[PDB]
């Protein structure tokens, strides 16, 4: 661990990362997060504000299941990577908040890697974050990517600490 200094995506480039992305893995943050059929649509508005509208199913209240429609606004910070997000369910009862939202790596067209620890363990870079594995096409990623998304999960800390997400029509 050590959240800071995790050297994140380089000369990031919002726009070029404004396509569509799909889930593929996941880190389990503490609490109730999204569940499956986790897609996200990255937009952008003249102003330079990099938005991103996720789509997903979460185990809300004991049984009941809801395909929750989410939204999120991103507010710049040094590194072109990092960001500050304030998401919110187009609909109430949907966990609103702010979370770190780096972008650890991504060729834009194929794979990417997003990290986000929101509390830090006693002075000492992080203590409980959630990470997503995104890829252009919902099928998988070539041999190259995977060999990187794999050699990051080590840098970013996590190796195997994931759990691939299905996507059975539901949202």
């Amino acid at each position: 661990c050590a959240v800071s200094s995790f050297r994140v995506k380089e000369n990031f480039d919002k726009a070029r990362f404004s396509g569509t992305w799909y889930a593929m893995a996941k880190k389990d943050p503490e609490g109730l997060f999204l569940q499956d059929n986790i897609v996200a649509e990255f937009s952008v508005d003249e102003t330079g504000q990099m938005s991103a509208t996720a789509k997903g199913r979460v185990r809300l209240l004991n049984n009941w299941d809801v395909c929750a429609d989410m939204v999120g606004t991103f507010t710049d910070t040094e590194d072109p990577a990092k960001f500050k997000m304030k998401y919110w369910g187009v609909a109430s009862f949907l966990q609103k908040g702010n979370d770190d939202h780096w972008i650890v790596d991504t060729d834009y067209d194929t794979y990417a890697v997003q990290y986000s620890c929101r509390l830090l363990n006693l002075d000492g870079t992080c203590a409980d974050s959630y990470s997503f594995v995104f890829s252009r096409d919902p099928n998988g990623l070539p041999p190259e990517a995977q060999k990187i998304v794999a050699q990051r999960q080590e840098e970013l800390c996590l190796a195997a600490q994931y759990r691939l997400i299905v996507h059975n029509g539901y949202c």
Partner: protein, 118 residues
């Protein structure tokens, strides 16, 4: 037996277990100063909050954390917490039962004990 608070989950129709509960009693200076606190058992009830000769006439406020409870279910709530202010008069009856019914965007509350004394 002194002031038995009790919670109820309306969505789940069960007892609000592990709900935090802080009670305050207006001080001279018009400020609230901690009186007792705890958590709702497995039944959703709160007992052992004070005693007959410590629980004196005055103005009391009861504060219950619903938000926590809710986010712990995963639903975003409306409120920030539910509050209950009330005159504890030596007036007659002194058995107080404080109940709440919580749902994501609303909560009610009742009190009991009458004045059995002609």
């Amino acid at each position: 037996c002194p002031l038995m608070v009790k919670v109820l989950d309306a969505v789940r129709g069960s007892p609000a277990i592990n709900v935090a509960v802080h009670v305050f009693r207006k001080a001279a200076d018009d400020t609230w100063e901690p009186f007792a606190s705890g958590k709702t058992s497995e039944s959703g009830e709160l007992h052992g909050l004070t005693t007959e000769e410590q629980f004196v006439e005055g103005i009391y406020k009861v504060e219950i954390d619903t938000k926590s409870y809710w986010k712990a279910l995963g639903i975003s709530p409306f409120h920030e917490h539910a509050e209950v202010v009330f005159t504890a008069n030596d007036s007659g009856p002194r058995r107080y039962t404080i109940a709440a019914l919580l749902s994501p965007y609303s909560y009610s509350t009742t009190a009991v004990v009458t004045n059995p004394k002609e």
